[PDB]
Each structure stands twice: as C-alpha cells, then as structure tokens.
Amino acid sequence: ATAGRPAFVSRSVLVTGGNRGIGLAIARRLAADGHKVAVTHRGSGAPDDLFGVQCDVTDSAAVDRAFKEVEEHQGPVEVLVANAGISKDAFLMRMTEERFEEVINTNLTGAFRCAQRASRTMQRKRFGRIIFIGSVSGMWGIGNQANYAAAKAGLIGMARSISRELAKAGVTANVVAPGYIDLDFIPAKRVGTAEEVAGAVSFLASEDASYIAGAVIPVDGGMGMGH
Amino acid sequence: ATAGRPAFVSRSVLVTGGNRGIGLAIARRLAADGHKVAVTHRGSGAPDDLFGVQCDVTDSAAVDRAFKEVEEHQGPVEVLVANAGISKDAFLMRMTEERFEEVINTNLTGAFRCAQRASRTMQRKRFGRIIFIGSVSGMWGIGNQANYAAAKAGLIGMARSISRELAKAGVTANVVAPGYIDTEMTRALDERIQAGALDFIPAKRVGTAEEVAGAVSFLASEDASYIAGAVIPVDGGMGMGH
Amino acid sequence: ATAGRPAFVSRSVLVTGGNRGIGLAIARRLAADGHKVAVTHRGSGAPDDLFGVQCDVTDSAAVDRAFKEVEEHQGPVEVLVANAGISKDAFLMRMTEERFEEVINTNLTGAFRCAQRASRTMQRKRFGRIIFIGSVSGMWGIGNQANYAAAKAGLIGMARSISRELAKAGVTANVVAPGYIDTALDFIPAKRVGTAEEVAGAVSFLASEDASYIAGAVIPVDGGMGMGH
Amino acid sequence: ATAGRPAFVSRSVLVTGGNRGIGLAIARRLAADGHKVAVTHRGSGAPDDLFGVQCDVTDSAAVDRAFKEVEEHQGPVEVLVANAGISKDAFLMRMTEERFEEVINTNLTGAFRCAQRASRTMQRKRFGRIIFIGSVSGMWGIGNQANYAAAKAGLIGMARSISRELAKAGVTANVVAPGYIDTEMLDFIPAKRVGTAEEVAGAVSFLASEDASYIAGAVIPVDGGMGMGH
Ligand SMILES: NC(=O)C1=CN([C@@H]2O[C@H](COP(=O)(O)OP(=O)(O)OC[C@H]3O[C@@H](n4cnc5c(N)ncnc54)[C@H](OP(=O)(O)O)[C@@H]3O)[C@@H](O)[C@H]2O)C=CC1
C-alpha cells in the first residue's frame, strides 16, 4: 500500500456555470490540480486558458452538443461539476409557478440533464465523478426558498439513486453543499470563500474519494447541522 | 393540562391523489378520524364515501378551482395531504428529459402548487398542516429513480423552507416517507423482485396503505403541533442511514 | 382492510423517570390511552394510581429487579419508554471526566440497561416497542453539551442497531427527540417552547398500533429547531 | 485569491489508535502530507517510522501525560485524530453491561478525553482540528452493535456540540465514518467492494488540510455508499 497521496490522474472535467463566481473558482482549482478543464458559458466565453463550450442547461440538445464538443477536445467527461444555478427567492404566498419552475429547471433538471449525458460514457469507461453543487438550504430550509431548497435537496436524492445504480461500475454521485459564500446561524461566525467550496470539489474529484458515494459534504461553517 | 389525547378538532382536509390506492386509504383514515375529507380525481369521479373535486396537480388553474370547490363544501383547507404522484423509473443512461420532467412536475411541482394555494388561508387563520407523501427513495436512493428520488427528496427541502417561514404562524410542513407498501403494482412484480426487496427491509415484510395512513393521521392530529420539517419514515427500517 | 384507527391493544408499559416532568406526562398519556402503565422512581413514588417500582438506571441489578416487579404486576414490558435523564453542561475545556461519564451513564448506558432487560421477553413474544427520549441536541449540537449531545446521539445509533437486529421479530426501537420543553426562541421556527403533553403525544403514537412499520426513526418534537443534516 | 491548493501548513498531529491498522494508515498518510505525526499505543510501541507515546484512552491521567509528551516532541497538538476503538459485538439479549460500557468507555468517552485535553491550546492558538473516526454503524445500525453503534453515533453529537461552541475560535470537530475496510476485516454496499485503509486516510488528510477550514460538524462517509439514508 502507498502511504501518501495517490498518484494524480488528469481527468476530463466539465464545470457547468464555470465562467464566473464559485464555478470559476472550482474550474481554476481543478485546472491547477492538473485536470483538463472545460466550462460552460452562455456567451461570455471561458476565462483564463480553459476550454469553453456554450450551453444552457435548460436545453437538452445544447447539453448533448456541449458534451460532444468537450469529448472531441479532451476526451469524455470523467468529472462533472454541476454548478450552474439560479436563485428566485420569495415567501411561499408570493412564489409563482414560473418562479418555482425556473429554479427547478435550471438547478435540478439542468443538473440531471448533465449527469444523464455524462453517464453515456462514464458507465462504459467504468469511471465517473458526478459532483452536484447543492446548498445548506436543501436540508436546513432557508425560509424564502421553497423552490431553491426543493431543487437543492432534490440533488441529494438524485445523487443517491445514481450512486446506488452505478457505484458498482465506478461511477459515483456526491453533493457539495455550501452555506453562505462570499452570521448568527453560522457557528464559524463568518462566510465562506469560493476557494473553500473549490477545495471540497477538488477532494471529491481526486484519487482520495473513490469510496465516497451519495454523500453531502457541507461547506457551511457548521450552519446546517441537524437532522 | 389534560393528561389524555387532546380534544379532537374536525379539520377541512384535502388529499390529492386521494381517489385510489394509498391516497384513498389516507383519506378514509382521516374521515374515520372525524375530519371533513375531500379528495382530488382526474375525471374518473369521487369515491362513493368521499367528496371529490376534479384536479390535475400539474395545472395551477385547476388547483385554484379545486381549493375553491373544497372551501365552498367544507371550509378552507386546514390539512393538505399531497399524495398525487407518478413513477417513470429507468436506468440513468436511458432516462429521457421527458421521463424526468414528468415525474418532477407531478410529484414535486404539483405538491408545491397545492401547498402554495393552501397557505393563503392557513397563514391568515394561524393554522395549517401541509403533509407531503415522500418516499424512502428520497434519502436512501432506490436505483433507477433519478427522477423519483429527486422529486421525493425535494419535498424535504420544500417542507423545511415552508416550516422555517410559517411555523411561527402555526403552519407546519412535514413529510411521510413510505418504503415498500403492498399494492396491486407490487403484487404484480415477479416473486424474485418482491423477495429481493425484502432483503433491504429490517422488518422483513412490506408495509400497508393503512400504516402510511396512520402516520398521516398522527401528523394531522392535535398531537403534532410542535413537529415541523420532519421526515416520518414508514418503511420497516429500510431507510436508516445518513 | 380496516379504514380507521387500528384495534387497540392494552400494552404493559414501563416509563423510566415517570414520576415528574416529561416522564409523568408520558405515563399519564399512555394510561389515558388504555395501557397498563408502570413508572420507575427513586423514592418519591408513582403518581395517580399508576404502578411504581424503585429503580436507579445506573444500577443494572436494580433495573433487573424493577422489570421483575412490573412483570409480576402487569405482565412483561411490551412498551419501554426510556425517559430517565440528566444534564450537566460545561464548556469543553471545563468539562471533567466525571461530568461527561455521569451524563453518559444515566442517559445512554441507563437506556441500554433498560432496553437490554426488556429484550428478554420482547423477542420471545415477537412484539416490543423500545422508545428512547433523545434531544434535538443529539444531531443539532447545543453548545456546552459534549456529554449530553453524545449521549442523546448515541441513542440513535443504539436504536438503529437494535432495530436492524430485531425488527424481523416485531421489536422496534425509535427515538423521540424533544427540543425546548416547558418544565432559545431565536433558534426555534415555531417561536415557542413545546409542552410535555406534546412529547407524550409522540410517544403515544410510537406505542400505538399505527407505528408497527416505524423502526430506527427520530421523531423531532422541537418546533423545527433541529432541521438540518 | 489563490487559484490552486492552498499552501501547505505542517501541523502537530496525534493519532490515537495510530499504531496499527487503519490508524497507522491515517498516521502514515498525514506524515507523508508533511505533518509532524505522533501516535498512541498501549505498550506494544509504535512502528519504527513514527514517534509513539504510550496512552490508554480510558485513563484521563494517561491522556494528559501523552499530550505533554507530544508537546515536548513536536509542539502542542493542532490536529487530533481519535481512532482508538474496540468492538465487542453481541445480540442485544446477550450483551452485558460490561461489554456495553467497555466499548463506550474506549470509543466515546476515550474520544472525549482526548478532545477535551486538546481543546485548551487549540482555543488559545485559534486553530484546531478534532477528527473523530466513527463508523457507518453509527447512523446505519449494523446489527449486534448496540454498544458500537451507540458510541460511534455519540461521536457525531459530540462533534456537533464542540463545533457549535468553538468553530468561532477556529476549532472544528468532524467525523469520518468508514464502512467495511480491508485492514479491519456486500449487497448493502453500492460500490460492491470493501474500502481500503488508505481511502479512509485520504478523507482524514482532507479534513486536516487547508481545504477544510469551513467544515464543522460534518460526517464524511467512506463506505462505498453503504450508509445512505436518514
Ligand atoms: N426541555 C426539556 O426538558 C427536554 C428534555 N429532554 C429529555 O426528556 C427526559 C425527561 O426530561 P425532564 O422531565 O425535562 O428532566 P427532569 O429533570 O424534569 O426529570 C428527569 C427524570 O429522570 C429521572 N432520573 C434521573 N436520573 C435517574 C437515574 N439515574 N435513575 C432513574 N431515574 C433517573 C428523575 O427522577 P428523580 O425524580 O428521582 O430525579 C426524573 O424523573 C430526559 O431524558 C431529558 O434529557 C430532551 C429534550 C428536552
């Protein structure tokens, strides 16, 4: 047995919503780790020296075409980070059907579209990491977020069903659940950074996370502790 | 303080998906409890013993009309049981966008449409019980259910967000999460499939629709006022974990 | 199939720490439900006309004697409510071994002693309800409660291992996890404390014929305080 | 903002139960990461590659003496990995008070004794990692383990209470929960294999690293999916 950090394997990575914000920090961290990193965008293009593909995750045909472009460039996606997401907060009595479904379609169905398309090759190659970006809200229930909490909790159920089916083929699905990212409900008494989220994603994309499936990694300063 | 079961209060109940199967058992239990029970149906009609309103939970306009019809008949809804649901199982690689979205739209968004419409009068009257029928799959992840597990876990997030907002106004949202429940569909699986499922159940038996209804009865009762955002698993221990 | 509440079965009940507080409300509720209710006490006696047995749950021999007295009076215990508990809070760097072990020994090991003794007959009769009284602190982690949170979370693990072994024989173990009960509001969505009778209502449900298919569950009675993961 | 892995900081590490098996893999991984690593043992000694201190975690005075010996060797403990543990399984009806209390005293109270002793200087320096090694059994309930599951779930409650109190001072407590691991030796495991001690060590490495500062009260399952549930 090797005592230290396992030898690095450069994986084909796709980060959806990887062109700015937390997604860009995730993409830059995975590239710095040594992975081949592609990001989706909706017109802004890709930053730094990352491979960009245009993709709206509400569009299944765009998702299919984006994955094909990534595969031609750098090989089939081995690590999917589904970071694309939106918030449309509202108290329950004021939340409209449109506002609920928009958040579901991007955050939950959009993550499904990417995971489903990624599985086409992951299962065949007997390796895959599907890493959903969830939220403390999924299990803690932020009060103006019936739609967002539903979508982000839904990622847990999806990750666990995917893992129960496919972990025997080397394909796992896990959730990183950030809290507030750049205080009374946060034990740490501070917000987190995008780089702290990216550090958990880096772990789940690494050779140190093969035996982790269906897990929620909370990056929230303890905010979401409970049951 | 009274020692025994609190005095019963007859609530206006609506059970979506209450016209057949497990939802019908839920509705019949709540009626036997003493509540005024209405059920939805999609055109096949109300059960002989229960007031029915035609309502497709994918149609926000139909949800609004149905709540108005219930209100006229028995007062505004105080206890909503969201049982309307469908399954479209598939291996992940085979699951189409349509199979995913149809399950989400009925099971998750349809439950939202009903909870949102119910909340109007619940907050104003400072009482409401929103009871989502989830599944062991939400937190345990039954294979071939990327859609169903996503929908049924989403009910937990929604229930907790609703509870954090509205519990102070006496409005709670909770989830009953059944495991394998004896139905016509389960008795039609091959015996190997039925036997294989028992291996994952510590109780080594399937549950009944009346056991699901017993948990719903509790959450609709005067014994559940201080329970909010909870998952009540009715699954013989199948879903134990984290 | 029966449409309404299942036919009632009058069970032999033992509530540990049943002479006051939450335990007394649990015992009185289960008696009103129609059960045959015994309580443990440490000298104060049982309330009402309930059957009392003297028992300190840190003493395995006393637990054995107490169950034998209940068995002789009303039949072997079918429903055990392990309510006896104590708290001894401290900041971590101030918490002593003594203060940690005292809380463990009563709240966790004491619950084990009662569950283990109850299992003598439950498995043979193919029925048992072991109901632990936990706390929101078990999974939420109230500060200054390294001992109490450890003990109350330990009840979850024990209930689940007991349930995985014995549910096939009709014996289940579950946890009722109260939040703040009148005998802080900033962390409670309901913006109120709970009552002992609300805890007892959850115990009544878990002792009833409506809860046979519930095993290893945590029923939170906390106004939403403990919501999380 | 730094794009890549944060600059490594060498921490003073103590791994209880680090002299053999899974704990030894944890200690060897943390040393390979660049940390200064000490392990406990109950008299058989540490392997020659690591500094060892004799310490029975059922003995509060021995825990105190062990921490002082580590302090004099490599500075006060900054990262505590509590791996010392035993199992004494039995059917519930057969399990004795002694068998229950022995597992609690080592696995739960012993972890407390070490976390309590570490806390003073961690709080003073405004940095601490307390990493309990739990088990899938804590939340999944392996049968015949009323004692082991109780102890390993108790670590979760303890980690959360410690985190709620001390996370604001830079001190966090988390749990790594292994499933079936090769060094300690299937339909319930989605991965359809046992894990390795080095896979557990990888999760501990993460929780000891500069990538885990904002994680407190978490359970990191290393179990092939075995424990998924609620
Ligand atoms: N807010 C709250 O009150 C909450 C309480 N709980 C739990 O509810 C349960 C009861 O709470 P509560 O009524 O408030 O506590 P109380 O102090 O009011 O009563 C505790 C009971 O336990 C008994 N007891 C304590 N130690 C022992 C022992 N070694 N052997 C036998 N009996 C013992 C006491 O008997 P005696 O009269 O002889 O002392 C008393 O009957 C406890 O488990 C507590 O942890 C959980 C969540 C919240």
Question: For residues B238 and B137, what is the distance between their CA atoms, to the nearest angstrom?
Answer: 10
Q: Which CATH architecture has domain C1-229?
A: 3-Layer(aba) Sandwich (3.40)
Question: In whole angstroms, what is the distance from residue D121 CA to residue D115 CA?
Answer: 11
Rounded to an integer, what distance in angstroms lies between the CA atom of residue B163 and that of residue B172?
5
CB contact under 8 A, A137 and B148: no
The one-letter code for the residue type at B24 is L
Q: Which chains touch B (3 or more CB pairs under 8 A)?
A: A, C, D
Amino acid at D112: F
Distances A15 to A35, A65, B133, C94, D11 between C-alpha atoms, Å: 12, 15, 34, 47, 32
How far apart are the C-alpha atoms of C30 and C9, rounded to whole Å? Answer: 12
Fold annotation for D1-230: Rossmann fold (3.40.50)
Annotated binding residue A19:
yes
Question: B233 vs D228: CB contact, 8 Å cut-off?
Answer: no
Q: Specify the fold of A1-227.
A: Rossmann fold (3.40.50)
Tokens 């319930």 locate to: D188
Residues with Cβ within 8 Å of B188's Cβ and at least 6 positions away in sequence, in order, are: none
Angle subtended at Cα B213 by Cα B209 and Cα B219, rounded to the nearest 5 degrees = 155
Please name which of B68, B148, B141 lies closest in space to residue B108, comparing C-alpha atoms.
B148
C213: annotated active-site residue: no
Mutate which of C86, C107, C193 for ligand 1 pocket (most atoms within 8 A of beta carbon): C86
Dist CA A7 CA D50 (whole Å):
23
Q: How far apart are CA D57 and CA C176, in angstroms?
A: 32
DSSP letter assigned to residue D171: E
SS3 assignment, position C36: strand
Q: Return the bridge partners of C132, or none.
A: C82, C175
Nearest chain C alpha carbon to D117: C93
What is the rounded distance in angstroms from the CA atom of residue C140 to the CA atom of residue C118?
29
Whether ligand 1 lies within 6 angstroms of the CB of C83 is answered as yes
Among residues B67, B148, B236, B239, the one annotated as catalytic is B148
How close is the nearest chain B Cα to the Cα of D143, in Å? 10
Give the contacts of B61 (CB within 8 A, at least 6 positions apart).
none
Contacts of D60 (CB under 8 A, 6+ apart): C97, D113
A119, A149, A158: residue with CB nearest B93: A119
The verdict on the CB of residue C20 being under 6 Å from ligand 1 is yes
Q: What is the rounded distance in angstroms from the CA atom of residue B121 to the CA atom of residue A124? A: 53
Residue A73 has a CB neighbour count (10 Å cut-off) of 12
Q: What technique solved it? A: X-ray
Tell me if D210 sits within 8 A of D120, measured CB to CB: no
Q: Is D1 exposed, middle or buried (0-12, 13-18, 19+ CB in 10 A)?
A: exposed
Among the residues of chain A, which ranges form H helices?
21-33, 60-74, 97-103, 110-125, 137-140, 146-166, 194-204
Q: Any idea what DSSP says for residue B6?
A: P
Q: Which residue has the tokens 């409300």?
A: C25
State the Rg of chain B over Cα: 17
How far from the centroid of its chain's Cα atoms is residue A44's Cα? 20
Q: What 3-state class would DSSP assign to B85? A: coil
For the domain made up of B1-242, the CATH class stated in words is alpha beta
Rounded Cα distance between D46 and D61, Å, is 20
Cβ within 8 Å of B, A 174-203: none
Neighbours of B169 (CB within 10 A): 17
Using CA of residue A56, residue A54, residue A172, residue D158, what is the dihedral sign? negative
Q: Which of C26, C42, C105, C109 is the best mutation target for the ligand 1 pocket, counting ligand atoms within 8 Å of the beta carbon and taking the most?
A: C42
Domain extents in chain B? 1-242
